[PDB]
C-alpha cells in the first residue's frame, strides 16, 4: 500500500537539508496550485544532539542534548522514505500550508517541534531518528 503517510520517517536528498532525517506531518499526494506535484509537509532536525559520554557533567549534557529543528515543504522526488516511523502527538497539525506564508508562524511551529523532539530524545526512544546519517 501507500507508505508516504503521517509519522513516516524520510531522508531529504536535495537542497540545504540534504542528508537530514524528517518526519512527514502531512502528505499532499495530488499537489496544490503552488506545488503542482506530489509533495509533503515535513519537520526535521537541522543540528543533531551531540554524543554524550559517561563522565560529562549535567550542564554539559544539557548543553549537548539541544536539537535545532526545521520545517519544510518538500517534493516526493527529494525524499528517501525509510521503514522507520516516528509517532508524536505533539506534532499533530503543527504545520500546514499557510504556516510557510508568515515568518512568525514558522518560528512558533519550530518552537513546538523543538520541544516535542527534545522530549522524545530525552525519553531515550527512537535513537535512529536522532543520530545523524554518515555519508
Amino acid at each position: 500500500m501507500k507508505f508516504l503517510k503521517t509519522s513516516r520517517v524520510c531522508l531529504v536528498t536535495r537542497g540545504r537539508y540534504a542528508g537530514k532525517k524528517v518526519v512527514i506531518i502531512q502528505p499532499v499526494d495530488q499537489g496544490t496550485k503552488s506545488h503542482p506535484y506530489g509533495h509533503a509537509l515535513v519537520a526535521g532536525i537541522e543540528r543533531y544532539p551531540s554524543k554524550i559520554t559517561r563522565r560529562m557533567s549535567k550542564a554539559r549534557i544539557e548543553k549537548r542534548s539541544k536539537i535545532k529543528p526545521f520545517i519544510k515543504v518538500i517534493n516526493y522526488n527529494h525524499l528517501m522514505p525509510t521503514r522507520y516511523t516516528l509517532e508524536l502527538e505533539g506534532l499533530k497539525a503543527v504545520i500546514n500550508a499557510d504556516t510557510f506564508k508568515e515568518p512568525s508562524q514558522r518560528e512558533e511551529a519550530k518552537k513546538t517541534v523543538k520541544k516535542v523532539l527534545e522530549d522524545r530524545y530525552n525519553s531515550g526512544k527512537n535513537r535512529w531518528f536522532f543520530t545523524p546519517l554518515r555519508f
Binding site: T85, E87, L88, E89, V116, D119, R120, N122, S123, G124, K125, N126
Partner: peptide
C-alpha cells in the same frame, strides 16, 4: 521535574505506539 515528566510521557506514548503497531 517537569523535564523528566515530559520525557516519561513521551516514552510512554512511544511504547503505546509500538504496542499498537505490533502541456504548454
Amino acid at each position: 521535574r517537569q523535564k523528566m515528566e515530559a520525557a516519561a510521557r513521551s516514552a510512554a506514548e512511544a511504547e503505546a505506539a509500538e504496542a499498537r503497531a505490533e502541456k504548454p
